[PDB]
């Protein structure tokens, strides 16, 4: 007999539980609905679902009518809206987390073992006809064909929100502290056990690595001086595992918390910036805390950098990403009243969702010169030759590509997208519309509705056979984008829960941690509270270049 | 200069932060007080502290006036009070946890690294005159002398609350899943990374161990049949590390989740009981879930046993320990409204606090026979000869010793108390009265007030020199006990925060987990909801012996 839980029968977060040979029952417990399939709303849930605005309508409000929003930003209405949206966007994420790749059920091993990526929706049961559901073809479309036809960039499409490469490298840099898939244990496992904003891309993902990187004097990190400017230490001075081209002299390498940051200068640029910041923070502490030691200095400086990392992400990174006129504000006290679980677990859906390779351009413009990918990647000497200032300026001045819409991934990095479609199929993710339903949206009824256009939609229908059999990763990048937006509706509504939960779920936002003593006096607490991207870049350089997440007008 | 933070200047959970060469400042942030030392109450906090009853007065209410309490139990006043107790006894424990042995400050390493025992109060700073504070002698009293004089049992003093050995072995069994100090890494570190009710004393503390113990058929654990009764497998069948006397035949050893349970029959008795229950739970699940596998069966049976473990501890274990007329009830939904962090971290203070070796008697009476310690401990064949039923009956009928008051630890196990006083000094715990202040009690003003008697108080004053220099572990056991109670005021107010946080901090109590699907249908959910000690013992035996936490009248 067929497995009933492959029809995805239960809506609104109902849990499909098999009884007997061919039956099922669903736990609509605390789902807000009732019935065999949890399709009968309770009195309040119906009240909510009727008085709701549509997600496209709310993007309209938040991206139009500035006069109203400038008034709302300067009044308390922001804080209430901050709480409103802040307290709402996190309820879609199970906490404590539920599932992982091996377990499609709540289990103690899925909770204790932090090496698993957690999961929002259970996997497609293995005993079912189509690889996605009861629906669709019996074979999935070729991954490399899908990419070469729909995700491959043909002409550079820039981000209409002015996003620059300075932003994209931060996204790569910032998100490679919790997205570190271990090739040895296979997809679905993670090396980054911090499972959040731990700055494990700076201080490494284990004690052994940070000890080799720490200078053990005044809490600082080891470093080297090239051209009179501070740079991270060479692998010779700091003997840590690094992924570098063979035969590269081990005095031109550099040691950082993330093994991979040597492969792009933009990532090492950020690692350089954070190290200078850390050592600068350590200098301020020792000035006001003469009696402290190396561990005391280091750990407090870490928390400071963690704090001002989250600050910059909320109020400048997400602020740019959303296009919202509602001023986003980092204030942990907004969640002190609500029941909030201060702990995160990276979900494999967040990993798939966050692959923003379309941000990368056709080639990299650094002032007068134009470096190709072969001429840019792996360049061990590019950062030192140009200096932090010139590279930060060059990236901030160069546009970055749009994420959504499709056909905007450069051919050099397209082999990632194919391996991601392959990975999505091996992890056995549920189809796209099922993730829409789980994230408070109605399923798309046809590919024409998805893409909002006729040619590429009709072909997709020929490959997949049915909209309900669409995959997760292809659907996100091919969805019609919001008007003059960087990516479409689904990427907003699905990534926003994970990102919020991962930034405000950090323990420093908790009531027990978010106090001035946690940061060794008010100096640290105000460094976190008043942090900006411009400050982080210009306080650690001899000059102040143009730094922002958007190109100048 | 002297370290100012050794005067313990800041009260009411104020954090001492050193500035400069010889200054300090305190973060009274969210402490409810104000001032340099957080001694100036706010309007509400003063309102609370004046309308407070004394802890001895509330014990009077909860242990007298049965007519009132029987009425309160059958009405909603129980549930409202349950919330009250839940929201009061849990706020004193930092979550996320703050300190550990190496770090006397909030740090990212103390949060991530689960091998550390966490901590409530920072260690006594190393640069200060006396080992406890600015106060007291320059040398602490000899630990072995303190034990032989004040903690050594002279005549068996029984528990006036009727506590039996059946209770005490459960306390040892239940609490050896989170109290597993690693001898290799030294005091202050833990092998039990679950840090709570993970039943790691049944399923081992790592995947390698549980796989060797699991039978991998219908989710069951391996086992062996002796005399027609189920017993845990011999080390030969299940090859896991065990601590056993040398040369003992391996087909007479037994393999369990906790390496140490072979050294006492009472501990192995409980492990036997839990295993039979686990395999019985696995039988019920397979009956209703034919399509499930070994991993699916096993993990759900684990959660069921975890649930009914917590149920038995709250409604029967603590019920016995407290003597409260208010019937305590296990209901996670009582905390759904409050902001409750569903995560625990074992505190080294809880480890010191729960060393209840006074419960152990002079000799163990098993029906007609009376086994000495040498004749009882390490007895590889005692459990199988007498059978589970006869031992459960024998222990429930035999009284257990009182914990508090002092001079009630048997000489066989007194070397533990000595090593605990040594361990407390190595971990560098703050003096007793400082823990009273941190746990919402006024400090004792003299040793005569502590013990409520004159002889042993005067000697303690001679050894210690000052009440404010009293150690943590001695103070708990020597404190005057509540009238006709097993232990005194301090053990109540200090243990209840850790115990409550560790049982209801288990994720299964969270809203995300506490549903019927988490236990594979209503059968699992009702096994958890209706669990009792009598059921756990008699459902897994051919006969039902006398099982209880109290001797018969
Ligand atoms: C030239 C630019 C880039 C290059 C060369 C590059 C390269 C790679 C490679 C080789 C992988 C491994 C995928 C696999 O082996 O299947 C990867 C994964 C990933 N990429 Fe990129 N990438 C670039 C830009 C970006 C950007 C701008 C983002 C923005 C978010 C991003 C996000 C990610 C993430 C989150 C992963 C997951 C890593 C993991 O799961 O361990 N990448 N990238
Ligand atoms: C015959 C009865 C008992 C024996 C033989 C025994 C034996 C031991 C031993 C040898 C230690 C190690 C201490 C050290 O090495 O410094 C220990 C620790 C401990 N004992 Fe017992 N004990 C008994 C009864 C109890 C009881 C009734 C309790 C009730 C709570 C208890 C609670 C503990 C705890 C919590 C630890 C801490 C273990 C750790 O920190 O790793 N013990 N016991
Ligand atoms: C106080 C602030 C609350 C708060 C804290 C921390 C993070 C967020 C956050 N927002 C968003 C977001 C929201 C709406 C529209 C667009 C975006 Cl990109 C995202 C996100 C979504 C998808 C992919 C990636 C990301 Cl990073 N993550 C966050 O929410 C916001 O600040 C904006 O929404 C109110
Ligand atoms: C829904 C119930 C919440 C709840 C769950 C789980 C455990 C507890 C708990 N209580 C106590 C306790 C509390 C007051 C007086 C006496 C005791 Cl022995 C203890 C404890 C204290 C000291 C040493 C050891 C222990 Cl085990 N542990 C608990 O708290 C209570 O039920 C009673 O609190 C007034
Ligand atoms: C809940 O959803 C399930 C699956 O979508 C529905 O079950 C199907 O019902 C149709 C209508 O008779 C049958 O033709 C299918 O054979 C059923 N499939 C399965 C697996 O049972 C069910 O009807 C829905 N519940 C309600 C009340 O409508
Ligand atoms: C977390 O889980 C993974 C996989 O479940 C564990 O790694 C596996 O352990 C088993 C048995 O020890 C081995 O047979 C596998 O070869 C290991 N690797 C993989 C990819 O499965 C890992 O040990 C667990 N981590 C912890 C702390 O328990
Ligand atoms: C790494 O980048 C450096 C620039 O710092 C490249 O060297 C430049 O190469 C361009 C032509 O590609 C010349 O116009 C510049 O004069 C060179 N500058 C220096 C200092 O050499 C270098 O070619 C890049 N490495 C790789 C492998 O492409
Ligand atoms: C906070 O507590 C500290 C320590 O008890 C107080 O410092 C003492 O103050 C008394 C009276 O001023 C002096 O006699 C002692 O010499 C001080 N001891 C030290 C180490 O400085 C301090 O006064 C308290 N703060 C307030 C406002 O009362
Ligand atoms: C947790 O912390 C402990 C102690 O800091 C770490 O164990 C020590 O690691 C250092 C460096 O690797 C060694 O020099 C010590 O000998 C180790 N043992 C002790 C008792 O210090 C441990 O590695 C950390 N665990 C994690 C997951 O980070
Ligand atoms: C382990 O306990 C067993 C009881 O099951 C002990 O054997 C008994 O010993 C007593 C005297 O101590 C005799 O009266 C009984 O006849 C014995 N019964 C059996 C079946 O042998 C045994 O001595 C204990 N082991 C140790 C090391 O003390």
Residue numbers in the entry:
A (entry chain A), B (entry chain B): 32 to 584
From the article:
To determine the binding mode and rationalize these biochemical effects, we determined the crystal structure of the ovine COX‐1 (oCOX‐1) in complex with the subtype‐selective derivative 2a (oCOX‐1 IC50 = 0.160 ± 0.001 µm, inactive on hCOX‐2). Compound 2a was identified in an unbiased Fo–Fc polder map within the oCOX‐1 hydrophobic channel between residues Arg120 and Tyr355. The methoxyacetate residue of compound 2a was the only part of the molecule that did not have a clear density in the crystal structure, possibly underscoring its flexibility and lack of binding interactions. The crystal structure revealed that the inhibitor resided in the active site of the enzyme in an almost planar conformation. Compound 2a bound to the substrate channel with one chlorobenzene facing Ser530, and another chlorobenzene facing down near residues Tyr355 and Arg120, the entry point to the active site. The ligand was engaged in two sets of interactions with oCOX‐1 residues, namely a hydrogen bridge between a chlorine atom of the ligand and the hydroxyl group of residue Ser530, and multiple non‐bonded van der Waals and hydrophobic contacts with 19 oCOX‐1 residues. The ligand portion in the distal binding pocket was surrounded by hydrophobic residues (Leu531, Leu534, Leu535, Ile345, Met113) and formed van der Waals interactions with Lys360. All three compounds interacted with the catalytic Ser530 and structurally overlapped in this central part, whereas compound 2a adopted an inverted orientation, occupying a hydrophobic protein pocket lined by residues Met113, Val116, Ile345, Lys360, Leu531, Leu534, and Leu535. This binding pose mimics the bound state of the endogenous substrate arachidonic acid. Compound 2a inhibited COX‐1 independently of the arachidonic acid concentration in a highly potent manner, which was confirmed in wash‐out experiments indicating tight binding.
